[PDB]
Every structure is written in structure tokens, then in C-alpha cells.
Paper text:
GIPC1 (GAIP interacting protein, C-terminus 1) and its two paralogs GIPC2 and GIPC3 are universal adaptor proteins that bind and regulate vesicular trafficking of many transmembrane proteins. GIPCs contain a central PDZ (PSD-95, Dlg and ZO-1) domain that mediates the interaction with the C-terminal PDZ-binding motif (PBM) in cargo proteins.
While full-length PlexinD1cyto failed to crystallize, we crystallized and determined the structures of a construct with the JM segment truncated (still referred to as PlexinD1cyto for simplicity), both in the apo-form (to 2.7 Å resolution) and in complex with GIPC1 (to 3.2 Å resolution). The overall structure of apo-PlexinD1cyto are similar to other plexincyto structures reported previously. The RBD forms an independent ubiquitin-like domain that packs against one side of the GAP domain. The two GAP-homology regions (C1 and C2) fold together to form the GAP domain. In the apo-PlexinD1cyto structure, the C-terminal tail region (residues 1916–1925) constitutes the C-terminal part of the last helix in the GAP domain, except for the last two residues (Glu1924 and Ala1925) which are disordered.
Author numbering: 1345 to 1361, 1389 to 1563, 1568 to 1655, 1670 to 1677, 1697 to 1809, 1820 to 1923
Write the structure that this text describes.
């Protein structure tokens, strides 16, 4: 089965560039009844929009509140408020209005292109939360198949162990620009039932150990696989002699001052040879304008193989499933369009840019470049290089105006994207009550998975760090002032600082 990550690990890897937020904090249990008091009070402040909005705006005014802090703050907020998604959303929307109003003297086409603010990161976390269903239901499967096809196609030819260059690839920079003879090899491998694994002559023994591990650990998530450097490989040449096969040993040869890694052909391993796997820089080499034709068609073959898989994926991402309409996407796109009308922005391009800078570029591009955010699978610099080419094509598909390989396909992708944004305009509008019932359901669903207490405590450190600034901000806000929020804020600080000393001291 497709090795999906649990929802918590998905959130963990996308929200933060964490184990603390998953398990209950092993803080002292004698001051714990006192701690829950301080966190409860602070929750009350956080759950009041007149505090939170002022709180965020105040932190962002600081010249020493770094970009990562604004992002760490945003994610902590998403986790803490995860049980109150409706309230979280409305906070985000107000904060988004403030962002748009602040950019009223700038080009509207530059909106939401980066993530240098608390709200921008909040948007990414909202999209992520709301698209996890899409992944599990429709997009996750073709994406995983594409990954499998990418890996399969590259393994057809040789791969350099050091440079990572191969015969097949989508990236012009990773082409094995050398012409080296390489014949396939089948190996009857054991693992203390015997199985058969295909490799190449030029494959190093690390690479072979890896290719073997993939066969024996097929129906197993990657985090449970042993490693190449953890296993040994043993050849059975005859009945009186066996040979442990390693990348480097006594048989290793030096050429031109450099030492070649031991290949499958270095030991001259025959076809169908019995092998046994068991548990236990720039000084060494392996295989070392206009692009020539002999390399060009190696790029074409790889693209041609995956083309079916790739089309399926983009279609999955850029189309509506009738069984389950994208309520969230529809809700935010209605918000963007409504926000544009109020300000005299009718230019179709800017709207297209807004939508694009909200969902496809915010969530999907990083998803295409980071499959580990979704699956418990392996990351290699080579597969990454192919994903970069693919993701760039997706990026180009979203625009309006090494980039030669997919040049023919992009115009059709653009029409799909335009056909996709039209679909969302064409689906029946969802009311606020309908969308909130959805957000309520999702909050109920994932209620006991995140440790909100740890999240609150981390947020508090920002509040403590800027204790006098928030106080001033709260008193400079007549609404916050009238409802005694600066008093309630100081009550939290006082109570928290008494509790933290009781625990750690």
C-alpha cells in the first residue's frame, strides 16, 4: 500500500522546517495543575480577536522579529488554534485584509508571492490543512506512481555514485556525459526465501546493496529500512571460497592518482550469481551552447516514459472531483475575488496571479519538490533534480507570459489551469454556515493529536520577549484598553512566570 504519513507527521514536516508538539511534554507533574491555569488564561487571550490581531501586528513592527520567527509564530498559532479552525480562519482573513490594505500603494500583481509575514505563512498552513484530504483521496496516488516511475526509469541505466549523474534524467545538468558500456545483471540474493534483483555492471556495491534493499523491503515504509552501510554483501563463487563485496578493499585499483570504487564488474560477478546480504570527496572516483543529439534523446526517453504519469498528476491537482468539491479552495477564492472588487481591481491577470500565489505556488510546488512531506520515502539529489524540472513546468503552467524539454506541453497546462480557476467560479457558492460546519468537523476530527499546551508555551515566549511592547500596543488600542486586555495580559505574564519557576527554576 501507498506509504502515506499520518496527518500529524504531514503537518509536522510542512509547518516547521516537531516531536515536542506530538507527545505530551514530560515537564514536572507537581506544578502541572498550576501550569494548566496559566495556559488556560493565555488561551482566553489568544481566543479573543482584539488581543491576537494587536499581538501579531505589534510583533511584526519589531525590527528584531526575524522572518523565521514570524513563520514559527504563524505555525504555532495554527497548531494551538487547530481545534478552533473557524476562529483561526477569520483571524487569517482579517490579517490578510491588513496585508492587502498595506499594499495599496504597490503593484497588486506582487501580492502573496513570498512568505515574509505571519499571515502569508498562515495561508500556507491553511492550504496545507485543507488539501490533505485531496492528497489522501485523489492526488496522492498518481503522485506516488510518478515517483515510482521516475525511480524505475533512472534505474534503467548507470548512475555515478559520487556525482549522481545518470544515463536517464530530466535535468540536463545531471546527464552522465560519458559513454560507458553497461550491461544488466541478475542476482539471486538471500536475506537471513531467496529473491532475484536486477542491477548494472557499473553499479557500486553500495548501489547494489540499495537496489537489493528495495526488493526485500517493498511493502515497508522507508523509515523502517536498514541502510547500505549497515549491511554486508557476500558472493558464492565456489564451494570452498566466498567473498565479502565492499566498495573498497585490497582489490581496489588506483588510476591517475585516484582510486576507483569497486563495481559489480570489478569482481567480475557472473549472471545469476548467488549473493548473501547480512547485518553487522574528490580523491576517489567511480565512472568519471547546443546539446548533442545522443544526449537529447536520453532526455526525451525519460520524459516520454513519465508523460502519462505526469499528465495524470497535474490533472488531479488542477481539476475538481464531483464526488468531493474543494470547499476550502472555493471559500478562499471567493474571498480573493470579493476583496478585489471592493478596491477597483477588475484586471483578470491580477486575479489569476492572486489565486496562483495562494494555492498552486504556496502549497503544490513545495509538495512536488518534497514528496517526503507526504510519504515515508527516500530523498535523493538525483530524483530531486527531476522533480525540480517537473515543478518548474507546473510553475510555468501557472504563469501568463533547461526549459526546453517541456516547452511544448506548457501551453496546454495553462489552459487547464485557466479551466480549473473557471470551475471554481462555476461551482455553487458555499455559505458561511456551510464552510464553518466543515471547519468545525475537521477540528473535531483531529482534536487529540496535537499538544496545544506545548504550542501555547512556545507562543508565550514571544509574548514574554516583547512584554512591554504588547502592553503598549494593547493600551494604544482603545478597544483592547476598554476591555482591560492589557490587564489580562499582565495577569498571564505574572501567573506564567510564577509557574515556569516552579517547574524549571
Amino acid at each position: 500500500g501507498i506509504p502515506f504519513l499520518e496527518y500529524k507527521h504531514f503537518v509536522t514536516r510542512t509547518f516547521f522546517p516537531t516531536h515536542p508538539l506530538l507527545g505530551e511534554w514530560n515537564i514536572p507533574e507537581h506544578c502541572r495543575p498550576s501550569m494548566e491555569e496559566g495556559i488556560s488564561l493565555f488561551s482566553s487571550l489568544l481566543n479573543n480577536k482584539h488581543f491576537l490581531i494587536v499581538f501579531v501586528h505589534a510583533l511584526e513592527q519589531q525590527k528584531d522579529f526575524a522572518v523565521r520567527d514570524r513563520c514559527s509564530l504563524a505555525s504555532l498559532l495554527t497548531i494551538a488554534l487547530h481545534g478552533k479552525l473557524e476562529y483561526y480562519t477569520s483571524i487569517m482573513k482579517e490579517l490578510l485584509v491588513d496585508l492587502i490594505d498595506a499594499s495599496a500603494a504597490k503593484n497588486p500583481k506582487l501580492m502573496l508571492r513570498r512568505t515574509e509575514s505571519v499571515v502569508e505563512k498562515m495561508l500556507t498552513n491553511w492550504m496545507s490543512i485543507c488539501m490533505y484530504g485531496c492528497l489522501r483521496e485523489t492526488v496522492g496516488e498518481p503522485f506516488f506512481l510518478l515517483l515510482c516511475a521516475i525511480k524505475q526509469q533512472i534505474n534503467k541505466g548507470s548512475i555515478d555514485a559520487i556525482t549522481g549523474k545518470a544515463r536517464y534524467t530530466l535535468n540536463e545538468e545531471w546527464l552522465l556525459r560519458e559513454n560507458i558500456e553497461a550491461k544488466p545483471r541478475n542476482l539471486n540474493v538471500s536475506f537471513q526465501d531467496s529473491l532475484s534483483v536486477r542491477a548494472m555492471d557499473t553499479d557500486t556495491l553500495t548501489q547494489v546493496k540499495e537496489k537489493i534493499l528495495e526488493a526485500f523491503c517493498k511493502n515497508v515504509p522507508y523509515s523502517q529500512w536498514p541502510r547500505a552501510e549497515d549491511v554486508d554483501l557476500e558472493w558464492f563463487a565456489s564451494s570452498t571460497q566466498s567473498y565479502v563485496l565492499r566498495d573498497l578493499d585490497d582489490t581496489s585499483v588506483v588510476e591517475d592518482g585516484r582510486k576507483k570504487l569497486n563495481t559489480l564488474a570489478h569482481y567480475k560477478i557472473p549472471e545469476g550469481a548467488s549473493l548473501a546480504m547480512s547485518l553487522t570527496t574528490e580523491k576517489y572516483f567511480h565512472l568519471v551552447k547546443v546539446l548533442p543529439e545522443i544526449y537529447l534523446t536520453r532526455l526525451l526517453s525519460t520524459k516520454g516514459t513519465l508523460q502519462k504519469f505526469l499528465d495524470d498528476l497535474f490533472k488531479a491537482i488542477l481539476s475538481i472531483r464531483e464526488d468531493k468539491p474543494p470547499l476550502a479552495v472555493k471559500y478562499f477564492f471567493d474571498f480573493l475575488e470579493e476583496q478585489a472588487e471592493k478596491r477597483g481591481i477588475s484586471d483578470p491577470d491580477t486575479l489569476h496571479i492572486w489565486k496562483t500565489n495562494s494555492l498552486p505556488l504556496r502549497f503544490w510546488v513545495n509538495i512536488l519538490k518534497n514528496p517526503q512531506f507526504v510519504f515515508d520515502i527516500e530523498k535523493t539529489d538525483h530524483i530531486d533534480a527531476c522533480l525540480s524540472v517537473i515543478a518548474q513546468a507546473f510553475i510555468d503552467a501557472c504563469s501568463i507570459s533547461n526549459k526546453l524539454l517541456y516547452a511544448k506541453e506548457i501551453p496546454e497546462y495553462r489552459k487547464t489551469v485557466q479551466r480549473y480557476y473557471k470551475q471554481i467560479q462555476d461551482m455553487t457558492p458555499l455559505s458561511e454556515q456551510e464552510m464553518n460546519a466543515h471547519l468545525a468537523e475537521e477540528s473535531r476530527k483531529y482534536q487529540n493529536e496535537f499538544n496545544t499546551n506545548v504550542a501555547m508555551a512556545e507562543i508565550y515566549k514571544y509574548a514574554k520577549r516583547y512584554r512591554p511592547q504588547i502592553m503598549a500596543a494593547l493600551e494604544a488600542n482603545p478597544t483592547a484598553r476598554r476591555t482591560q486586555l492589557q490587564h489580562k495580559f499582565e495577569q498571564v505574564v505574572a501567573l506564567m512566570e510564577n509557574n515556569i519557576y516552579e517547574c524549571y527554576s
